[PDB]
Design an enzyme around this catalytic site. Structure first.
Site, short mmCIF file in Angstrom:
data_model
loop_
_atom_site.label_atom_id
_atom_site.label_comp_id
_atom_site.label_asym_id
_atom_site.label_seq_id
_atom_site.Cartn_x
_atom_site.Cartn_y
_atom_site.Cartn_z
N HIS A 174 10.05 2.92 6.09
CA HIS A 174 9.17 1.93 5.49
C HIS A 174 9.45 1.79 4.00
O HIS A 174 9.53 0.68 3.47
CB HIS A 174 7.70 2.28 5.73
CG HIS A 174 6.75 1.19 5.36
ND1 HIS A 174 5.41 1.41 5.15
CD2 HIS A 174 6.95 -0.14 5.17
CE1 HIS A 174 4.82 0.26 4.85
NE2 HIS A 174 5.73 -0.69 4.85
N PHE A 192 0.83 -1.20 0.00
CA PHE A 192 0.00 0.00 0.00
C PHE A 192 0.87 1.26 0.00
O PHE A 192 1.84 1.34 0.75
CB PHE A 192 -0.92 0.00 1.23
CG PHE A 192 -1.91 1.14 1.26
CD1 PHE A 192 -1.58 2.36 1.82
CD2 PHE A 192 -3.18 0.97 0.74
CE1 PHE A 192 -2.49 3.40 1.85
CE2 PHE A 192 -4.10 2.01 0.77
CZ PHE A 192 -3.75 3.22 1.33
N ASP A 214 11.14 2.19 10.87
CA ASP A 214 9.84 2.12 10.20
C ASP A 214 8.78 2.84 11.02
O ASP A 214 8.66 2.62 12.22
CB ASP A 214 9.44 0.65 10.00
CG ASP A 214 8.40 0.47 8.91
OD1 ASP A 214 7.27 0.99 9.08
OD2 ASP A 214 8.70 -0.19 7.90
N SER A 258 5.45 -4.86 2.57
CA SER A 258 4.33 -4.35 3.35
C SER A 258 3.09 -5.22 3.19
O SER A 258 3.04 -6.35 3.69
CB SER A 258 4.01 -2.90 2.97
OG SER A 258 2.90 -2.41 3.70
N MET A 259 2.11 -4.69 2.47
CA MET A 259 0.86 -5.40 2.21
C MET A 259 1.10 -6.60 1.30
O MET A 259 0.26 -7.50 1.19
CB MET A 259 -0.17 -4.45 1.60
CG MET A 259 -1.60 -4.95 1.61
SD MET A 259 -2.81 -3.66 1.27
CE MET A 259 -2.21 -3.04 -0.30
#
Lengths: 438, 438, 438, 438
Positions: free
Chosen positions: C257, C32, C228, C98-99
């Protein structure tokens, strides 16, 4: 997702569109010079309400093709027609904005309202923008519109920022109603359009819709801000209200031209209030039609009367517990097992409050289909045609061909937490299976 | 249902057979001159016990073909072999009667016991009927058997009534152990056989089985009445007992030759007592094998230990309530949903005491298969191959080809009261799906 | 390039994807709210290393379709499975971000690791983000994630600038690790996503992957940033390391991130080191398997031991003189002319020492093929089949269905630079010609 | 609209192209790193003049596919060849910019000039940018271009804002010759391209086009900005001028590199002037040779002087009405109906000013001629050949192998519904018809 509407030279004029949600189809037509994504605040509220949203991009704008031909409202309406024919929409709602209202009024006049249940005109052009000796209620002479067309051809990219200032009234709304990031996307959407479309579209703003207005027989909604720049309220909506008194008239206080984003709270409130009042009459007409097919299986007597009231309270929304119902449904003397299953099926589709814990066996063995492999192999072929189906009128038509055996197993697939389809086409399978038993 | 075993001229020597029930295959071989229907009292008790009964008609007898060739025990055994090969029976039980015991002992000797778990000899011919200078333990010289063959060729229909008197001892058993209507059917069965078979079969009664007996390595059961006429006990079973001491020896007191009908209470009691003691060792071997595939999905830890004991108590037969189990199974931290479904599936196949009222949702959504139409369309093709499948070794082999997605939906079909297959092949699907997750 | 992964109403849910390079298929799954083009710094590093990069866009994000249905990891994994099956990949490495790390663990725990060789988890979501009483290792309670969704729904475009400020930590990296032009592009992709997709995605962030971790039976890589802001390292990778200890744990110091762009140097170095450490064991016992077929053609003697070292000192990674070998292989008494062209071909592929000049003659006269049109027309048939081939087995299974004389001519074009293949495909041909001499 | 021009593993390489207007096809090829939308000012004047504008996006740029292979002018020309053949353009015009000027010289050299009428090189690379020992007139050593590639690989997006800063001379032309918003969109077009393309394309800048220059046998136009910072005029246009002195040479004073937008008012003026002359010459050169063939069908006398004048007057575009000609042609003493049908067929083509009216009747009656079963059906055989033929000589050669009765009949087919083919192919039939009747 693309729909072809024309053919230019060696290319095909394709239009971008999106078909989301399940229920009453609400077609949204954007304005100049954006895409179908501009309705993202309206599409949000229409989905939470339960409506089926359909947004398409006008030719030369958005992700659609960018041809250098067909830039009049006779072509813009012929495109809307092809879309409605391809999608086979019935009893849908057309909602227009800016230029979008010019297609809503032209299609209705030129093609009729067989597929139309209600319409809406947000920040409309109607009835006339051009000021002539014929029409004093115009906004500006043709010299003004010719000043815009030339200003686009000089530098359409630099023209956008000026236009998107009189679009949202940034000197009043920026940092309050609309953020600069939100504006940037609108520019990005406009700049990613056809250069020819940006220069030919303004020549359609001054179109005479005075002949198209009287042909509006369906319920209509007229909405317009009181701070509109592109389309002065006293030259459009105020004189649109006198041309069609049947339509409800709503003036949003202090709203700019792009009131789809700035006053989303106001627009969505009025838009939903209009739909739920102009669609309520037909949205429950199916509920009495589905009830009709369901009752045509129940043997006449004292049971048929109570069952019919177990459908009235449920379809309406009255509190009904399934445990007292499903137990009572099972222990029935005259009800054959197959009808017990259909009733048990319908009674689960219509309530989201089954506590989500238990299932019933009397229906599970009724919607079985004997267990024949060939009978199951056809049932999945129906579900395949139903998982790509949308309407109740279409789901019933298809599920009327397959034998009564395959219909039972196909109902089981949906009931036994295997397959999954909308509740509108679920009734289609039910009402089609009911016509078999007649 | 027919199985081809030979080829005579322009015809094919086909044999009639019946394959009923699910479980450990028990092949029954009749005697002279009846059909496979003569085991109707034994087949009844074998079905209630849970065994899979397979009865076939010998060539020239019953509904089978009636050729004029191949009337020795080398052909009679070659037919039994072809049947076992066609049916692909594994770890089955061969139970013979009269002439039937002559094939049980010949096949074992000539083809081995790879497919044999245990055998039985009811009113057997073994080891020798013919009385020669070599064998004093014979019943009669060859002049006697030649007296029967001629007595058949004169009038085989009139010969039957005399034979069926020394078959049941009607002067002692009629009106008590056996009715005259029951006798009539035996005559009807014999008279509806091949005329050539009735005249050639007695020449196989005096066959030397002394070489075939030592080749019996599997557990065996020897049974014989003490009032047998056709086969004197002191010339058959009494000297059969000395040849094979490993076999359990049972003498039914006062039983005739056709003790399959007269003393059905005695025969069935001993036959089931022998099977449940000689098959118990392998009948639970699957239960620890199925347990193995099931546990190979559970993540190692405190859960894997308790789950394994929820399988031990259940497979054995200990009282276990599903509500405490299924609730506990659902609320699991480390168990992925797919394993919850398999456990929920297996825990329903093994107990008939689920109260027959409720179903679970956590498994129903696990054995879903996403809802993909292609995934469901393959799942029904598996169930089609499983509804015509019988063995656990065959159901697993087939359900190891299809993808892990189709396996989940196919398990759902059986679980959601749609499809229906035996619990032996149900484990096959489960254990095959478990090997996928390895 | 698109892949149909579903069907929403009258529209087909298609996902954008790219496929470059030759070698081990490395799938890159973004997070995302970016897209497949966010891996552009990793893709350039993997293509030069000698891998095959496969990036694709998640539904509703990037250049893929933007539906309103199927926003959960069970659905996200269903798409990933379809992409993997449609491309028919084998020995593929799954890398997520991440996602995108959630789709790697969910697929691996529901569809198996048949096509998977290794996995990677950069900026993981695992094992649990939501903070309840069941686990203190959560990041934030439900009340926090509801604030995110509400912020997206309020202003989707203004939300990003506050999200991308904590994505790359612009108060630390802007003007240094990342320029403002790189931020604007990341915004342009986030804005061109889906309106429903941007608000229904954060609700999938707190998905529980605890029941999917032990299913990982392939070499893994858990990498994270110690700075992060979106995914706290203490609530993700720090506890993920305990649930997956046999995975190479790497903490990039001071990384935000969006470390794919900021600390690209640190990530690529760590990612390439893992791709070598996990795939080395498979290249061995394959390069020796290649050598096995190579040494078979060599006559068993003092030469079969020397040529073994001449191969094992090249497979390892050492350098050598091409002139020495091509004169030590040329002037040789025991080797046949054909097996000179074979060794001369294997060397010409395993050597980087080009020296930048002319190409040998004796191998041309060995891999000639007698100049036979029929035998040489069969040679181009394999080339068309090998140009569409990927695995080593797939090349050997096809190149074995041709005459050994045709394989020589087929190894001629690939040698004579008239045809081009990969490395495992080339060896698949050579190790097939070697099989045809036994 | 896309066109497949190759294949890359699992993905196909497609190019985004557009087709607009009717008339002489003008292919516009963009440069680095923009797309086909950069011609939106040149594509405007060309449409207002009566040309057919075709813009296609180079691979890795614009909306086209983004592969990682084939970044060289040998491949780029193949891409152009595929586009031209797929669209079947005849007598088109190639106009290139920056990188696009390399795809014009490479196509003509490798593929020919059958489809090309004229070419144009706007801000060209020709002949050789690399400054070598044998090529003193270079621009920069390879150490420079290798610096650019490295500069892009570090930060592709931040690189653009420095490139476009010199591409347009934004310290001299910003907010005057080019708006700020115009720059931003050009940046968006760049950032939305292939990441590998932006790193591989700069290596194609120093391509030796000296091997392609002599192949040019068509009218050319060399235009270049005097203040081109990116592409020095003294190192390109000046030396390119010597290699091709036949080309009309034009220097726009004070123009940067992106003179398509800043100096659109100068480029459009020159490009239109060149096209309206060079194409006008071909419409006169290959029109006077038609008169030569026509004046071989007409007997010597005043009719060979009156037709000659009325042909040379019509060819010169002198305003006249066909109804004077078509009637005066009819009432003529010597001419046979056939040569009265040929003349009328020419007057309909060479006089576009047809009053906007009908066809004629005597030409329709004379052309068909007999309508012989095979001879008329040998006219539809030639009709299939001429629709595929693209040149004038090509149409002449094929139709010269057919009878005058077939040529006349074939002319009768074209006259009724034209067309399909072009006038240069239709004249190829008329001149071939006249050549036969001699």
């Amino acid at each position: 997702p693309f729909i072809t509407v024309g053919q230019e030279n060696s290319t095909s004029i394709d239009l971008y569109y999106e078909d989301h949600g399940t229920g009453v189809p609400v077609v949204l037509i954007h304005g100049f010079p954006l895409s179908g994504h501009s309705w993202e605040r309206q599409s949000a509220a229409l989905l939470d309400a339960g409506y089926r949203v359909i947004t398409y991009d006008r030719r030369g704008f958005g992700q659609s093709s960018q041809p250098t031909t067909g830039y009049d409202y006779d072509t813009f309406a012929a495109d809307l027609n092809t879309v409605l024919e391809t999608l086979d929409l019935q009893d849908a709602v057309l909602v227009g904005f800016s230029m979008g209202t010019g297609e809503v009024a032209r299609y209705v006049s030129s093609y009729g309202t067989a597929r139309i249940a209600a319409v809406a005109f947000l920040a409309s052009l109607e009835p006339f923008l051009l000021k002539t000796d014929d029409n004093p209620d115009g906004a500006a002479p043709q010299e003004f519109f010719d000043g815009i067309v030339a200003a686009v051809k000089a530098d359409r990219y630099a023209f956008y920022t000026g236009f998107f200032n009189d679009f949202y009234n940034l000197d009043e709304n920026l940092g309050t109603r609309i953020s600069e990031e939100a504006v940037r996307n609108s520019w990005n959407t406009a700049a990613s359009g056809g250069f020819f479309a940006a220069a030919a579209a303004p020549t359609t703003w001054y179109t005479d819709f005075r002949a198209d207005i009287p042909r509006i027989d369906v319920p209509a909604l007229i909405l317009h801000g009181t701070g509109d720049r592109t389309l002065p309220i006293e030259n459009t909506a105020r004189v649109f209200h006198k041309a069609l008194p049947s339509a409800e008239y709503v003036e949003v206080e202090g709203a700019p031209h792009g009131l789809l984003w700035t006053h989303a709270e106001e627009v969505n409130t009025a838009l939903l209030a209009f739909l739920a009042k102009a669609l309520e009459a037909q949205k429950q007409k199916l509920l009495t039609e589905v009830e009709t097919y369901v009752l045509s299986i129940i043997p006449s007597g004292p049971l048929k009367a109570e069952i019919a009231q177990r459908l009235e309270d449920v379809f309406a929304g009255k509190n009904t517990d399934l445990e007292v119902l499903m137990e009572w449904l099972k222990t029935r003397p005259i009800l054959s097992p197959l009808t017990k299953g259909i009733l048990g099926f319908v009674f689960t589709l219509t309530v989201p409050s089954e506590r989500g814990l238990q299932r019933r066996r009397f229906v599970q063995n009724a919607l079985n289909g004997n267990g024949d492999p060939n009978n199951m192999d056809k049932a999945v072929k129906l579900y395949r045609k139903l998982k790509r189906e949308i309407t109740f009128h279409g789901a019933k038509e298809i599920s009327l061909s397959y034998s009564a055996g395959a219909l039972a197993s196909c109902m089981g697939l949906i009931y036994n937490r295997m397959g999954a389809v909308t509740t509108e086409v679920a009734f289609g399978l039910v009402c089609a299976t009911c016509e078999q038993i007649a």
